[PDB]
């Protein structure tokens, strides 16, 4: 997250860190005690058996007893097309069930087919690049929905008046709009915080019935 701010500790208990060799590489969202959702490109050509799903984290540079670590049991995608950047969404089943508490909670999803209009105010977040290196503390950022320079197959956002936006390592992280998870960070154009192109998110509302068919 470029030009964002440190989140309050455990403000977004549904926020997840996906790690490889102990290092954060993508975000995800807890959508049931035994399922997280992230971006399909986060597991494309990865050895899923080594992916550690970390729940209840805040500062990735500190030892945190609030954390709950799971492994990935199964992968569920729905027409992910890397060539055309479509349906960048994956549901990862966990090898167990999370203990729901103050620091680990399930996210709420929108109704199937709910489209957001221009100007809707959202909150983006993640442990990706700051512009400075990877963030230690979870970062959040106020963003606004735009339908220009964006496809019907994405939810796009922009920061009005400043050089800020999502960056590398924020992929898979949620976009929260009116309390619901409406986006999964997918890609940026013209580099991070360009002020030319909006950041692109997988449109979660287009997949709700399918997510629900899996997580029940």
């Amino acid at each position: 997250i470029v030009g964002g701010r440190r989140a309050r500790p455990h403000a977004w208990p549904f926020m997840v860190s996906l790690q490889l060799r102990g290092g954060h590489f993508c975000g995800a969202t807890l959508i049931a005690p035994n399922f997280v959702m992230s971006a399909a490109h986060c597991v494309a050509n990865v050895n899923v058996r080594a992916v550690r799903v970390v729940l209840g984290a805040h500062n990735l540079s500190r030892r945190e007893p609030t954390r709950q670590v799971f492994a990935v049991q199964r992968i569920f995608e729905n027409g992910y097309d890397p060539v055309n950047l479509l349906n960048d969404i994956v549901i990862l089943q966990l090898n167990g069930s999370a203990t729901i508490n103050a620091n680990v909670q399930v996210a709420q999803l929108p109704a199937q087919g709910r489209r957001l209009g221009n100007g809707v105010q959202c909150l983006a977040m993640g442990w990706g690049l700051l512009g400075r290196g990877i963030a230690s503390v979870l970062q959040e950022l106020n963003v606004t929905v735009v339908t220009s320079l964006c496809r019907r197959s994405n939810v796009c956002t922009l920061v009005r008046g400043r050089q800020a936006g999502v960056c590398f390592g924020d992929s898979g992280s949620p976009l929260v709009c009116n309390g619901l998870i409406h986006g999964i960070a997918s890609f940026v154009r013209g580099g991070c915080a360009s002020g030319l192109y909006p950041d692109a998110f997988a449109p979660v509302a287009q997949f709700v019935n399918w997510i629900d068919s899996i997580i029940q």
Partner: nanobody
Amino acid sequence: QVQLQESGGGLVQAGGSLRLSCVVPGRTISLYRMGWFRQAPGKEREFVAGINWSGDMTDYVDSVKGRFTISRDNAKNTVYLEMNSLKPEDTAIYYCTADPKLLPLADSSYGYWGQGTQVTVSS
């Protein structure tokens, strides 16, 4: 849409030099990692070299360190592979690669691959 068109292959004499290029046609998606893999016939794909989106970090295979240099040009969304002191064991189809994941440059988890170009080092 997302494409990797390479150029700069061909023949060279042992000890020679060659420069390869790879463009990501259009400002369609900013890819964190860009690099080069290579494959000799009937052998496995080999990471050769890689680079950050910023250019602050690079990595190479130990068999090409000091001889090969990888550079990037975000303005022309290109990557280049300067190959010097070429050995016949460097003969392979060189593939330009790209990927969005924030992972080590040497991690063989690249999603985007070019068609490859033939580099043939003589003897």
